[PDB]
Design a protein around this nucleic acid. Structure first.
Lengths: 158, 55, 324, 305, 177
RNA sequence: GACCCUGUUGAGCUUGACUCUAGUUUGACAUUGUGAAAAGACAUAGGAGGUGUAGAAUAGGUGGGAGCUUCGGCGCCAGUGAAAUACCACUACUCCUAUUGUUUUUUUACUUAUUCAAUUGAAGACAUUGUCAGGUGGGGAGUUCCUUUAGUCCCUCGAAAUUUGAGGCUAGAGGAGAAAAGUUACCACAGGGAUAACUGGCUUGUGGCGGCCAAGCGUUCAUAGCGACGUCGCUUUUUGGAUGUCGGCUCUUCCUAUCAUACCGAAGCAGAAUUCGGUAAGCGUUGGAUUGUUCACCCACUAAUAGGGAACGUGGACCGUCGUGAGACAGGUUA
């Protein structure tokens, strides 16, 4: 049943992506590593060595959180999320980081540590809420240490 | 290797290698079934007569 | 049969059972299938040229000089420029940061050219959440008059103020007001504009929650709110002016409760409104009758826009005239 | 465009010269009337193609990139005054030396960019005189062919889908004569086993090609995906349209039965006929088969123009 | 929409005049007879036409969001800061201009101070610290800043040496999105 | 060093009271008329309609009603539809026409209003003016209820082919005064506090998360519970480039975690060539292309041209001066 529910999600992603792929202008804005190297030419630096989530690729930051630089290789946009009901783990995207209890500063940059609540897209699950509505964003607590092992693991708070 | 470049302790580097070597290990262990097929078709291909269509 | 068609469509596209049934009804069967392809399919990316700081040709030359693959889109627009490929990100170009061009959609273009804004004219926008419409209207009056930007959410207002002051508009005041209350505040405008909160079936590519999260209850309160939104538009405009001023009704939905029903309710309750040819180059006429109910034949002058015919979002445009 | 396998590419070039162009043998008694160029990829492929045609008996000159200053003049002199019939260039020797009015062009290796094909066929069929241009397409070189369709905007036919395909306007792909290909690949394998020097040139150009495969600019994903379908499609292995309608009939009466041999699926692999026997049963259970409405005036298209 | 007092009036025009050449065109009567007036909302000041200022008096004070063009912000210590919203009028009649090359144009958009290796051409009569407004080749307004060193001293530094400071750049429109 | 704190400065965040009102503003009504030309609205009287879909169809609608019946056309029926056609019975909208009128505007003028020169001329029904009904009000004068949640599904206003939305009412919880205040795991500056510093039975080959199973032990027992090996779901699948200072060479010595050479064990290992493993350090152990430099890959030679150790073998540092939205100094002496 866990294989069947994972197959239904994976098959649904397959036909949408294969049959309905349409050419669109989509390029990635340049990193903040070369942005700071340009700025420094224009140990004083402060660089975050914890795993982060950002969202929109090419944005300017507020001047409060602008000395901090988050490298490209420490970013994750997808997490492995377990649902205690139906006992299924899937990959769903991370929408935002809600609260990091270790540091309220780390909440603002979106530092992914243990017991950190994130918002995840539960569209592929299709869990039916009250009033016959399909969920789009739930709480999920991170239950691993993503700095030590590369994968980000989480459980849905349902 | 990107993760290791920004690491900050010997514990962190130890845990990151074990993840990488472990993740490549569980990929090969999943590949068990086709490896037996390719071993058996290798034995039978080498034990096949040589036929040259041109002659 | 029809019932097999509804169950198969809801299974393969993932729509709700209700909204698939409503959308299947307004189309012929093969036309419905071609519509379901397009509205799920992402739409082309379109650029509006700021007339104030630049114009169509020299901006086009500048972006190709930065590696952006463009093409002038249609004979409809002297202001629109389609994009096809771009090495540099679109928001990264220094032309963007000065405000030479702004990201828009096609459906954001046509209400503004449905309006005919002139110089030294007092105008309005009850919902200017992305701010593209407001910057387009100010491009037509050439930095004159006054625009009253309005949006009921402060979070969207920050993007409004950022977009307006980058584009160099200098003539717009932005207020966080519920637009039902707005004619009590001022009234007496020339050319009012309304982009109502809508069901969002016209654009599912940007917002894919309407696939299921839109039910019977939502289809009663939401068109109900457009009515109080729309009756305020007549009750705020001027019956007479030195330059004649007109209302424009623009919704991002293809639904029939949201569109062609609200305009029937408005033209019945206020007899001092007429509707004439809306000035957009193309389109499809509105339906005079949908489900046993008759609308006045002025709706043949209204224009409906569809994803399958044009690569645009689903849209309704109608323009009003005030009499008394 | 002819569908050839990698092991029959040399014999396929011998078909085009022998029975498609009907080139004369030996030295010819202001170019010649036949005057066929041969385009390839690497200087090691030049040395094979030149030295094989000397053993074939055709008059061939050759120029490549790091060829000597004096050596380049004498061979482009010989081609221009009509003392030889075949000129073998890679692409860089082509764009350096001056090319006269040319009749036929052979593409031994398919150009990676579709615009390189234009540059090659631009060297021929100019000034109102008629011309021909043949290419040996492969399975791995197929996506570069479907990308050539999208650039020229032409229609593609597969073997004998049309009775009379238009060669000058439509892209026509297919297979060569089966019988005469197996004779002239027998000759290639006979010469390869006989003389050591050509055999040493094969081993050099085998590893030279393997580098060229790795560094070639890859084709697009849509061209890559659409290549899988035409391989599956029944027109890929059918006889080419030049060879006539009369050649199509006895090919049809045989391959209508032969294609059922190729489409066979074994219900039992020979290891089923132990732990390995349970393994063969384990795969087949896991991997068994799985059960206009737009106006012409305004339609924002995802393609330019 | 409180208009500025006497003390607040000298502060805004002072730092304006350290960047402006003709202060009389800004406050000048135009053809319609209505002038440009300065109001302030929520400790930030706005530069507006008087007529649109007059009909802006209808909105409630702690309810109105923004109005016309923001000249800058009143700080808590009573000083005045410029924002890039002030740039369209500031670059309209600027007094010292700096042109930077395309490889130095994007550094300003990312937010670096101007270094010697990017300047396209300079203007003279610049003291050791003078306000200046930066453009590319096409005279597109990119920002404003203060000259780091004088007419002689700025160049005798290294080609890796900062020649003009960063104060504000057009890239801050890319933040509030 | 990190790290904690104090003061100044930025980025904010939350406030900064109530009632009339200056100012300012929206709408309405008057002076403000007299003609012409048009246009529009309604007042009545006529004429004609109608193709979202499907249905054969240019279906307003509605009451019934199954041959009313001239031909048995049309019917009945059947479909198809939200609604179905025969039959009689009713009345809606639109577009025209008319006069069987009330009007309202726009334009064009004039002055019969109104405003200036004058103290008779021009503008000209424009302004302008005043009164009601509003919006705002950091200003002037005095003065010391809202927020969060639920219900009455009760009343009022809306909307809907019968159910909703917005107000009203009720009840669980909160409360020296435009001069300036509280807060931040925040920024820049100045200062204060704290560890003399790291490892020395460290390190290596087999990932994390959740579920199932589970011998034992335990608060009293395998159920307060801790829990390996496996297996399942995610990463992960049905068509084959990465690297900052360093080197470069010779030489000595050691380890083995062995590339070669010696020996064995196993493999459809026929032969040839190998592959995996084990004992083994006696004996040997490269280049080239490319590179900032190396590795990866590719190419060539060779028996092979393994990897490491030798306290990682032997040949600035502030201070002062001027700046403060940023920055510097032919500035200093000293480490």
């Amino acid at each position: 049943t866990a294989k069947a529910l994972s197959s239904q999600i994976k098959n649904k992603r397959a036909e949408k992506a294969a049959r309905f792929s349409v050419p669109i202008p989509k390029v990635r804005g340049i990193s903040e590593e070369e942005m700071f190297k340009v700025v420094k030419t224009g140990g004083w630096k402060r660089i975050v060595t914890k795993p982060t989530f950002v969202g929109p690729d090419f944005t300017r930051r507020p001047v409060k959180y602008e000395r901090f630089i988050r490298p490209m290789g420490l970013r994750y946009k997808k997490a492995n999320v377990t649902h205690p009901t139906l006992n299924v783990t899937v990959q769903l995207p991370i929408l935002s980081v809600k609260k990091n209890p270790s540091n309220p500063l780390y909440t603002q940059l979106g530092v992914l540590t243990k017991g950190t609540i994130i918002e995840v897209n539960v569209s592929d699950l299709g869990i039916v809420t009250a009033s016959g509505k399909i969920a789009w964003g739930r709480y999920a607590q991170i239950t691993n240490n993503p700095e030590n092992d590369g994968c980000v693991n989480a459980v849905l708070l349902v | 290797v990107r993760l290791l470049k920004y690491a900050q302790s010997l514990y962190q580097c130890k845990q990151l290698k074990r993840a990488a070597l472990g993740r490549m290990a569980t990929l090969i262990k999943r590949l068990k079934d086709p490896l037996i097929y390719l071993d058996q078709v290798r034995q039978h291909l080498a034990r096949l007569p040589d036929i040259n269509p041109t002659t | 049969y029809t019932n097999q068609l509804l169950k198969d469509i809801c299974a393969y596209y993932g729509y709700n059972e209700y909204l698939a049934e409503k959308l299947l009804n307004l189309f012929p069967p093969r036309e419905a299938f071609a519509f379901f392809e397009a509205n799920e399919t992402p739409r082309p990316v379109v650029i509006r040229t700021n007339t104030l700081r630049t114009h169509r040709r020299d901006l086009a030359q500048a972006l190709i000089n930065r590696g952006v693959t463009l093409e002038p889109v249609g004979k409809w627009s002297k202001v629109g420029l389609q994009v096809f490929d771009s090495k540099v990100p679109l928001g990264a170009t220094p032309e963007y940061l000065a405000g030479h061009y702004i990201l828009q959609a096609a459906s954001s273009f046509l209400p503004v050219m449905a309006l005919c804004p002139q110089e030294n004219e007092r105008c309005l926008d009850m919902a200017a959440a992305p701010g593209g419409k407001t910057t387009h209207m100010a491009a037509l009056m050439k930095n004159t008059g006054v625009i009253f930007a309005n949006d009921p959410s402060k979070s969207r207002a920050k993007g409004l103020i950022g977009n307006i002051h980058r584009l160099g508009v200098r003539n717009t005041i932005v207020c966080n007001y519920d637009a039902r209350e707005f004619p009590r505040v001022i009234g007496g405008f020339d050319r009012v504009l309304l982009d109502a909160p809508c069901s969002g079936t016209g654009v599912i590519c940007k917002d894919p929650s309407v696939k299921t999260n839109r039910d019977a209850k939502d289809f009663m309160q939401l068109p109900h709110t457009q009515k109080q939104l729309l009756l305020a538009a007549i009750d705020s405009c001027n019956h007479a002016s030195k330059t004649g001023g007109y209302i424009v009704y623009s919704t991002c939905s293809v639904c029939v409760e949201e569109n062609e029903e609200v305009v029937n309710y408005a033209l019945s309750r206020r007899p001092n409104v007429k509707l004439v040819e809306t000035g957009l180059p193309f389109g499809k006429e509105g339906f005079t009758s949908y489900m046993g109910k008759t609308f006045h034949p002025s709706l043949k002058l209204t224009r409906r826009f569809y994803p399958h015919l044009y690569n645009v979002d689903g849209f309704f445009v109608a323009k009003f005239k005030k009499i008394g | 465009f002819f569908s050839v396998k990698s092991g029959e590419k040399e014999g396929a070039l011998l078909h085009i010269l022998y029975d498609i162009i009907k080139m004369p043998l030996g030295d010819p008694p202001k170019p010649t009337e036949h005057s066929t160029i041969i385009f390839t990829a690497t200087k090691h492929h030049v040395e094979y193609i030149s030295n094989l045609l000397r053993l074939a008996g055709f008059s061939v000159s050759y120029v490549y990139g790091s060829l000597d200053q004096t050596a380049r003049k004498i061979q482009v002199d010989n081609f221009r005054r009509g003392r030889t019939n075949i000129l073998v260039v890679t692409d860089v020797a082509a764009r350096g030396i001056d090319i006269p009015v040319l009749a036929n062009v052979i593409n031994y290796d398919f150009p990676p960019q579709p615009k390189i094909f234009v540059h090659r066929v631009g060297r021929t069929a100019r000034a109102g005189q008629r011309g021909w241009a043949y290419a040996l397409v492969r399975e791995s070189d197929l996506p570069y062919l479907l990308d050539l369709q999208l650039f020229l905007g032409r229609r593609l036919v597969l073997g004998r889908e049309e009775k009379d395909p238009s060669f000058a306007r439509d892209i026509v792909v297919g297979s060569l004569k089966r019988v005469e290909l197996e004779n002239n690949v027998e000759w290639v394998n006979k010469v390869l086993h006989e003389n050591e020097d050509i055999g040493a040139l094969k081993r050099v150009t085998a590893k030279a090609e393997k580098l060229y495969m790795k560094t070639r600019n890859p084709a697009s994903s849509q061209s890559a995906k659409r290549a899988r379908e035409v391989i599956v499609s029944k027109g890929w292995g059918q006889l080419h349209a030049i060879f006539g309608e009369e050649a199509a009939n006895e090919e049809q009466v045989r391959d209508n039965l032969l294609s059922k041999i190729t489409g066979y699926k074994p219900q039992e692999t020979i290891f089923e006929i132990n732990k390995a026997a349970e393994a063969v049963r384990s795969f087949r259970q896991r991997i068994g088969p799985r059960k206009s409405f737009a106006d012409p005036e305004v339609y924002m298209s995802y393609t330019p123009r | 929409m409180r208009p500025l007092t006497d003390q607040e009036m000298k502060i805004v025009l002072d730092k304006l005049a350290n960047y402006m050449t003709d202060l009389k065109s800004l406050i000048a009567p135009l053809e319609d007879g209505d002038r440009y007036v300065f109001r302030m909302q929520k400790d930030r000041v706005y530069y507006v036409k008087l007529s649109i200022a007059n009909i802006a008096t209808c909105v409630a004070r702690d309810k109105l969001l923004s109005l016309g063009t923001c000249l800058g912000k009143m700080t808590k210590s009573g000083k005045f800061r410029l924002h890039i919203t002030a740039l369209p009028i500031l670059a309209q009649n600027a007094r010292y201009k700096i042109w930077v090359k395309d490889n130095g144009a994007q550094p300003f958009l990312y937010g670096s101070n101007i270094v010697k290796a990017h300047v396209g051409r300079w203007t003279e009569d610049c003291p050791e610290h003078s306000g200046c407004v930066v453009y590319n080749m096409a005279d597109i307004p990119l920002g404003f800043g203060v000259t780091a060193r004088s007419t002689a001293e700025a160049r005798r530094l290294d080609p890796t040496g900062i020649v003009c400071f960063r104060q504000a750049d057009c890239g801050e429109y890319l933040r509030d999105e």
